Amino acid sequence: LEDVVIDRNLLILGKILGEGEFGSVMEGNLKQEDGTSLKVAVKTAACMKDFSHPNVIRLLGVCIEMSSQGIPKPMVILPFMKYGDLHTYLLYSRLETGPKHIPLQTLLKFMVDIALGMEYLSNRNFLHRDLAARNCMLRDDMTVCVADFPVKWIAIESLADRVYTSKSDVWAFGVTMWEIATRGMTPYPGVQNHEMYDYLLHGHRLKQPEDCLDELYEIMYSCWRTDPLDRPTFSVLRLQLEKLLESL
């Protein structure tokens, strides 16, 4: 990975934007090769840089800092998304001052973007393992891209065993569609995490939102079929969403 590494001097770190897993995420400035500086986010691997898709977050590079004691502390440089995560954006839209009421057309486009992003990763046999609205970021052109690659998002087979495939990502995508259609509801209202396995095992699934089209609910429902092989691929789901969108 001698290609992805960036000189520490080219990076300036600022405030903390949020906590994530095993370390804090911070704002920063990255001086580029063209002399200009770019706003970035820094998580305090080489294959991710090979990823290239407008609906997938790009790796800008990584830096390694040596602390006063010589302890190494690696840092992952990612683009700065001022509009933030999609999950939070959906909730803000429900309030005044925040963005306007997001129409169905725009909501579907969010789903398409995510489907396009996953289609790209699925073709490279890369598993996401944590797809959710909170892990989808909004770019300055208001297009969505997947990032950050949780019991209520994990597929039924992935709970029973440690088996995980693209069909598991499809399951989580179905839930993400539901978050979007409901504008940020927590999955399975009235159901607690420790009850999820028995809840799904008994055949229960996420219920249809009030103003959600039958055609749309059919798409997301197909993601939750018990047998992973019965679930459609991302390339299928993407075209279904696209056709449904153009029909409006």
First to last CA, the chain: 46
Binding mask 145-164 for Mg ion (x = CB under 5 A): ---x----------------
206: partner contacted, choices ligand MH7, Mg ion, Cl ion, none (Cβ within 5-8 A by kind): Cl ion
What phi, psi does 169 have (nearest 5°)?
-65, -35
206 belongs to the binding site for Cl ion (CB under 5 A): yes
* Residue placing its CB nearer to Mg ion in the complex, 88 or 143: 88
Which are the catalytic amino acids?
A: 130
* Residue placing its CB nearer to ligand MH7 in the complex, 113 or 148: 148
137: partner contacted, choices Mg ion, ligand MH7, Cl ion, none (Cβ within 5-8 A by kind): ligand MH7
Residues in region 163-192 near ligand MH7 by CB under 6 A: none
For the CA atoms of 149, 154, 155, 157, what is the dihedral angle to 10 degrees?
100
13: partner contacted, choices Mg ion, Cl ion, ligand MH7, none (Cβ within 5-8 A by kind): Cl ion
DSSP assignment of 11-22: EEEEEEEEE-SS
* Residue 28 annotated in ligand binding: no
Among residues 17, 185, 236, 245, which is the contact residue for Cl ion, using CB under 5 A?
Answer: 185
Binding mask 58-97 for ligand MH7 (x = CB under 6 A): --------------------x-xxxxxx------------
CA distance 100 to 15: 29
* Residue 49 annotated in ligand binding: no
CA distance 182 to 89: 12
Of 16-24, 164-172, 194-202, 209-217, the segment contacting ligand MH7 by CB under 6 A is 16-24
Q: Report yes or no: 137 and 145 within 8 Å, Cβ to Cβ.
A: yes
* Residue 22 annotated in ligand binding: yes
DSSP assignment of 22-77: SSEEEEEEEE-TTS-EEEEEEE--HHHHH---TTBPPP-EEEEEE-TT--EEEEEE
CB neighbour class for 83 (10 Å; exposed up to 12, middle 13-18, buried from 19): middle
**Residue numbers belonging to the annotated binding site for ATP:** 17-25, 39
**Residue numbers belonging to the annotated binding site:** 17-25, 39
- Contacts with Mg ion by CB under 5 A lie at 135, 148
- Contacts with ligand MH7 by CB under 6 A lie at 17-18, 20, 25, 41, 57, 78, 80-85, 137, 147-148
